[PDB]
Swiss-Prot record, chain A:
Compartments it resides in: Nucleus
Naturally occurring in which organism (per UniProt): Homo sapiens (Human)
Function: Specific down-regulator of the NEDD8 conjugation system. Recruits NEDD8, UBD, and their conjugates to the proteasome for degradation. Isoform 1 promotes the degradation of NEDD8 more efficiently than isoform 2.
Cysteines joined through disulfide linkages: none
Induction: By TNF, IFNG/IFN-gamma and IFNB1/IFN-beta.
Protein name: NEDD8 ultimate buster 1
Residues of the full protein shown: 79 to 173 of 615
Subunit-structure text: Directly interacts with NEDD8 and PSMD4/S5a, a member of the regulatory subunit of the 26S proteasome. Isoform 1 binds to NEDD8 more efficiently than isoform 2. Interacts with AIPL1. The interaction with UBD via UBA domains facilitates the linking of UBD-conjugated target protein to the proteasome complex and accelerates UBD degradation and that of its conjugates.
Tissue spec. comment: Widely expressed with lowest expression in the pancreas for isoform 1 and in leukocytes, liver, prostate and skeletal muscle for isoform 2.
From Swiss-Prot, chain B:
Oligomer status and interactors: Component of the 19S proteasome regulatory particle complex. The 26S proteasome consists of a 20S core particle (CP) and two 19S regulatory subunits (RP). The regulatory particle is made of a lid composed of 9 subunits, a base containing 6 ATPases and few additional components including PSMD2. Interacts with RPGRIP1L. Interacts with CRY1 in a KDM8-dependent manner.
Species this protein is from: Homo sapiens (Human)
In-chain residues carrying the UniProt-annotated modification Phosphoserine: 20, 22
PC repeats mapped onto the chain: 68-101, 102-138, 139-173, 176-210
Annotated tissue distribution: Found in skeletal muscle, liver, heart, brain, kidney, pancreas, lung and placenta.
Name the UniProt record assigns to this protein: 26S proteasome non-ATPase regulatory subunit 2
A GO biological-process term: regulation of protein catabolic process
GO MF annotations, alphabetized: enzyme regulator activity
Length: 95, 227
């Protein structure tokens, strides 16, 4: 309704909480925005989380509407040992 | 977590290969040790060898071991999807390419036997089932097939089936694709899969029918007709 989607966000059992959670949000927003909002609503590190959406990856530089999200789309949140850019950099510096 | 060397318990046998003739990190026994570490410490979610020295042990393997050894971690991290999936990331962006292929299969192999409403492995390996490098594509497709064996869901099957006609992919990729389609749809005898794989196996020529990996394609058919 009203151009807002109730995204079903799934958090790890490592953070002991409800496995399936509802997040009401818009669709004009971008990937940086979705990771930031998931992080603040569930108290996670926005740079240490990777969101998988509608059987795909987040298009971080692209908006939600373009990447294919809609109402009732599942979103798995995944933690990282380093930052999402540091996930590249850490190995990219060790040869 | 047990150590492959301790499973061999070289600390007690008379090491008749030692001293000067043991000071090499040769490929073959390193691959054997990685497989042993994966098998013995499987599903326990932790290791002492390839967690602390994760990158370091990988650096002393070579060639197909990277596609193997990295994927070995996936067996240790079985069914803790958010466990392995937080651990393969350091290798999801690895400078090494073969170990990237192993990691991209470990991601899927972690999801083997369990189904998630999110289908995380589907999401991760969907964009790499047509990767240009054969190793990346192979790891992605093997992991995705393992993550969804017996699922029979047609989105994955329709993502998989175009690879049969994809003659540009190396043959072993077609073999792994047939194997994945077979285990994803076991015994169902579904026409959508079956007719496609029958036409796939129908077109190969003499030099293709005799090659090493084609022998898997009939199995991909047979798996769809189990029992």
């Amino acid at each position: 309704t009203t151009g807002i989607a109730t995204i079903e966000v799934f958090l790890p059992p490592r953070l002991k909480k409800d496995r399936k959670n509802l997040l009401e949000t818009r669709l004009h927003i971008t990937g940086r925005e979705l990771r930031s909002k998931i992080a603040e609503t569930f108290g996670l590190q926005e740079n240490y989380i990777k969101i998988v959406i509608n059987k795909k990856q987040l298009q971080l530089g692209k908006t939600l509407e373009e990447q294919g999200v809609a109402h009732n789309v599942k979103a798995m949140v995944l933690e990282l040992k380093q930052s999402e850019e540091d996930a590249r950099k850490n190995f990219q510096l060790e040869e | 977590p047990k150590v492959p060397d301790d499973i061999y318990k070289t600390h007690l046998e008379n090491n008749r290969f030692g001293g000067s003739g043991s000071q090499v990190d040769s490929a073959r026994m390193n691959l054997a040790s990685s497989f042993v570490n994966g098998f013995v410490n499987a599903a326990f979610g932790q290791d002492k060898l390839l967690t602390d020295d994760g990158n370091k042990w990988l650096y002393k393997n070579k060639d197909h071991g990277m596609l193997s050894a990295a994927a070995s971690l996936g067996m240790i991290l079985l069914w803790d999807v958010d466990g392995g999936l937080t651990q393969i990331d350091k290798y999801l962006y690895s400078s090494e390419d073969y170990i990237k292929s192993g990691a991209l299969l470990a991601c899927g192999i972690v999801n083997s036997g369990v189904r998630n409403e999110c289908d995380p492995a589907l999401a991760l390996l969907s964009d790499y089932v047509l990767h240009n490098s054969n190793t990346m594509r192979l790891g992605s497709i093997f992991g995705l097939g393992l993550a969804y064996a017996g699922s029979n869901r047609e989105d994955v099957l329709t993502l998989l089936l175009p690879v049969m006609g994809d003659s540009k992919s190396s043959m072993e990729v077609a073999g792994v694709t047939a194997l994945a389609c077979g285990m994803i749809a076991v015994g169902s005898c579904n026409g959508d899969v079956t007719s496609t794989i029958l036409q796939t196996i129908m077109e190969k020529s003499e030099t293709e029918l005799k090659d090493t990996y084609a022998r898997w394609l009939p199995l991909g058919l047979g798996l769809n007709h189990l029992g």
